[PDB]
């Protein structure tokens, strides 16, 4: 059968193939430096003077997904773009964008004070309820 001609080794070129299979490498070094690189996708939150940024960034540095209160769509629906309400709203928007992007797990790396922050707590809860787990699966060796 001509259709049965299959190469002995399959070449899946999808960048997220092994990451989704939980088999890809994740940089395990950098034990004396912060933040850890041991992740596939990182949730990075930037609280500027006026705005709030929430990025989902692959370990290689590519910004897979973004959600900025600087976008008209989001900034035209909240009073202040630099408050706990803004952080929670941008977290929910980012959660929706991640789910539609196929990103279901991430590694959040807050500083102690950021973790203690009410806004960061609200953003984490928003992501969790939106369906994003801020804890990546262990690699399979």
């Amino acid at each position: 059968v001509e259709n049965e001609a299959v190469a002995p080794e399959f070449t899946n070129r999808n960048p997220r193939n092994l990451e989704l299979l939980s088999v890809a490498r994740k940089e395990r070094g950098w034990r004396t430096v912060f933040p850890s690189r041991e992740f596939w996708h990182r949730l990075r939150v930037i609280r500027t003077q006026h705005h709030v940024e929430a990025l989902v960034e692959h370990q290689n540095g590519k910004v897979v997904v973004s959600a900025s209160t600087r976008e008209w769509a989001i900034k035209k629906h909240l009073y202040s773009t630099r408050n706990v309400v803004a952080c929670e709203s941008i977290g929910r928007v980012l959660a929706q964008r991640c789910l539609e992007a196929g990103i279901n797990f991430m590694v959040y790396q807050p500083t102690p004070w950021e973790a203690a922050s009410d806004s960061m707590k609200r953003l984490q809860s928003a992501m969790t309820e939106g369906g994003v787990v801020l804890r990546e699966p262990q690699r399979i060796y």
């Binding site: 989001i74 629906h77 909240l78 009073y79 202040s80 408050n83 706990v84 309400v85 929670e88 709203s89 929910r92 928007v93 009410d118 609200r122």
Partner: peptide, 9 residues
């Protein structure tokens, strides 16, 4: 709502 941290989007 913003000052009561209850507003949504």
């Amino acid at each position: 709502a913003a000052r009561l941290r209850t507003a949504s989007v």
